[PDB]
Amino acid sequence: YSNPHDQIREQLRLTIEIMKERQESELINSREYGLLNNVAPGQLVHTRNGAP
């Protein structure tokens, strides 16, 4: 079934898209690295009323 679209090519393409979405999520949210966990004390602000 590889005409006109390569089956392995599309399978790997969609896999890599999902993996890069996960990679961005881990750049934000990982527990080892990740911005939301590696923020120094004094660099954390709180809202005054709740709305930004």
């Binding site: 079934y1 590889s2 005409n3 006109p4």
Partner: protein, 46 residues
Amino acid sequence: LALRDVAARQLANATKTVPQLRTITPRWLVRLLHWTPVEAGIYRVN
């Protein structure tokens, strides 16, 4: 008494054939049919 045949044969190469399969048939039908290629595994006959 001289050299024997088996003793002399110990120094000789045998001619070994590739294994013979008795179930090989001429397979005429495959040779007689016309074969058309199917680009992606589906063939629709209208």
